[PDB]
Structure 1
Amino acid sequence: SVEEYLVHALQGSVSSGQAHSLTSLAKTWAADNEGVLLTEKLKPVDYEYREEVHWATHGRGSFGEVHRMEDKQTGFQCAVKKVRLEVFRAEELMACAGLTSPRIVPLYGAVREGPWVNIFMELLEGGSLGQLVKEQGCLPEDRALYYLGQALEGLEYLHSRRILHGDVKADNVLLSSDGSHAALCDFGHAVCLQPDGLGKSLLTGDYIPGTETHMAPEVVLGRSCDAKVDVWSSCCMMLHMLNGCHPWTQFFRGPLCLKIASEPPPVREIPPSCAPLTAQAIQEGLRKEPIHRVSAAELGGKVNRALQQVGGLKSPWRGEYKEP
């Protein structure tokens, strides 16, 4: 209404503004150079911010969609996620913009150029939790608990704001230079939960999930979904971290969605040598029925206690190769 008059003003130009503008503009895209930049270090020139003209590229995502970039005026280096326009979802920015949490990769701005949405964000120097698991087969339990713990703090943030990530997994967790900090990214599968708590459903075409192996049973059953899907995924992530491979992967080859539906939870993939409280945390996080599944916050507590049970975090950042 007033947002309509507003967006028309924002269109056709790249400006330095706030998150609300970006969000509003974003909705436009989800339905020629324009956008909003949320940091001083990324500076438009004369209403424009074009690739190879104002900023240059220097690929690491599921789609090789993410690059190191540099602003040609300012010298500042960050990351660009290229997303095609016809596929773009405002929830990528909605579940991201102005979210002041150290567990969520900060958004630096987003700029449309032609059929491309260029999403700018902090470049975290230590890469993805996924790459870390690849490099060193699997992670020590305490290290595994540590990162799950930090991902849960980030999800607790999202959920309390009525936001569901949609695709929680090691590849979508990023790490600082020392590996001390972990923060969520890729909100491409994020959904905004409407006033009535739980929402959408995969079959209606609103919650399109990201990674099959990490997908909760209520998703596959075409049931209504809430934040609880993230909690299931985060434990699939936990299994990935502990075993050096996704759930279901080592056992079933074909349409997993049908297996996830009717099998017991991947609970059998829990390493026998794990601390009982770690096993319990995963077990509670992998309850097939969402209502009885613990919340991110509830799991955070159990995870926190389990880390203490294993003598705290005393594993080196990078050292041992631990065979899958």
Structure 2
Amino acid sequence: LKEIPDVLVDPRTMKRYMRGRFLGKGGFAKCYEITDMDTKEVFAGKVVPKSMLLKPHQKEKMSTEIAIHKSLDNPHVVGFHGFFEDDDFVYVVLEICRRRSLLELHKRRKAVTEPEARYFMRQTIQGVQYLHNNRVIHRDLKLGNLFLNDDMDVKIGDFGLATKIEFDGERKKTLCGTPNYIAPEVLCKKGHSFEVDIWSLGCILYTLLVGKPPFETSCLKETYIRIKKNEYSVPRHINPVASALIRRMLHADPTLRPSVAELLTDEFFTSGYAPMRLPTSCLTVPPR
């Protein structure tokens, strides 16, 4: 095909990026640990081949994603540090996250401790609040999108399904893609806004504490019925305070779901132990 250059350069910034070790792939893009040959600063180079963006429809979807991500600057969102292209590839320079995502933690750990849940959710909700304040809906929040760095800080990434609302009471109807945890109002095409991110956070909190997704089934058609009917059960083993929060976040009526600001101040975060830091050991074992 076309070998990805060992040195990644752009006509604009004129910086030379040394392509390094493989980090993983996503859909059609391959990710490499890239280093600035001048400053010695380390970044994550996302490489998308132009053969994947032949259609002008596909060129737009990425142009929307890049624009949104560019305007973002937050300690709980993956940092955007420029993008460029040659005649073969489009290179997006992102903030490096060496500890994969919360999904890899979930598969390895299953049900995490409650204090861990608090920590992960707090940092994630803080990132979601900033997005909502800047009128950005993620629409595709999942454990695989909650990246982690050497410090075990949560950083929200992948804005491939993110949309920015323009006016006051705008309720979107077009979602060009298949997100993991989707709100019922999206499945019914009834229209959606900010509160689809809250629904997703409900699923995330459920999955962290229980050890399995709230609507997990081998059949895809069966999963959507469960969501539509609002069919889920939080086991009795879960903290009453936590289960209460999950039920409100996963409410069928979008206007009865808590707002982002309401989440931080909920009993769940203020009642029990909430550590400010986590050791990298939490990737494999519970904290002792």
Partner of 2:81, secondary structure, is strand
* TM score, norm. by length of structure 1: 0.73
How many residues get paired? 265
Does structure 1 residue 230 correspond to structure 2 residue 203?
A: no
Q: Partner residue of 1:255?
A: 221
Identity %: 23
Task: Find the counterpart in structure 2 of residue 183 from structure 1.
Answer: 155
Q: Is the 8 A contact 1:164 1:192 kept in 2?
A: yes
Q: State the Cα deviation string for residues 170-212 of structure 1 (Å, max 9, x = none).
A: 1101123132x2111111110111214333313xxxx224434
For 2:213, the equivalent position in structure 1 comes to 246
Gaps of 5+ in 1: 1-12, 17-43
Cα RMSD for the two superposed structures: 2.5
AA in 2 matched with 1:259? I
1:54-108 CA-to-partner distances (Å, cap 9, x unmatched) read 5324232543632212234443321022334343423322332242311111111
**Deviation digits for residues 125-145 of structure 1 (CA, Å, limit 9, x no counterpart):** 332111111222231122112
Q: Distance in 2 between matches of 1:89 and 1:197?
A: 26
> One-letter code of the match for 2:202?
C
Shift of 1:114: 3.0
Q: 1:135 to 1:261 in 2, by over 3 A?
A: closer
Q: Residues 131 and 61 from structure 1, CA distance in 2 versus in 1: closer, same or farther, beyond 3 angstroms?
A: farther
Q: CA deviation at 1:112?
A: 2.0
In structure 2, the residue matched to 1:197 is: 169
Amino acid at match of 2:219: R
Q: Please give the alpha-carbon distance, in whole angstroms, between the structure 2 residues aligned to 1:126 and 1:254.
A: 30
Using the alignment, how far apart are the partners of 2:276 and 2:107 within structure 1?
Answer: 21
- Greater mean deviation of Cα atoms: 90-99 or 185-194: 90-99
Larger mean Cα displacement after TM superposition, 310-319 or 129-138 = 310-319
TM-superposed CA distance for 1:257, in Å, is 5.5
2:208 is matched by which residue type in structure 1?
Answer: M
Task: Tell me which residue corresponds to 1:156.
Answer: 129
Q: For 1:220 and 1:144, how far apart are their aligned partners in 2?
A: 28
Q: Distance in 2 between matches of 1:239 and 1:61?
A: 27
Gaps of 5+ in 2: 1-9
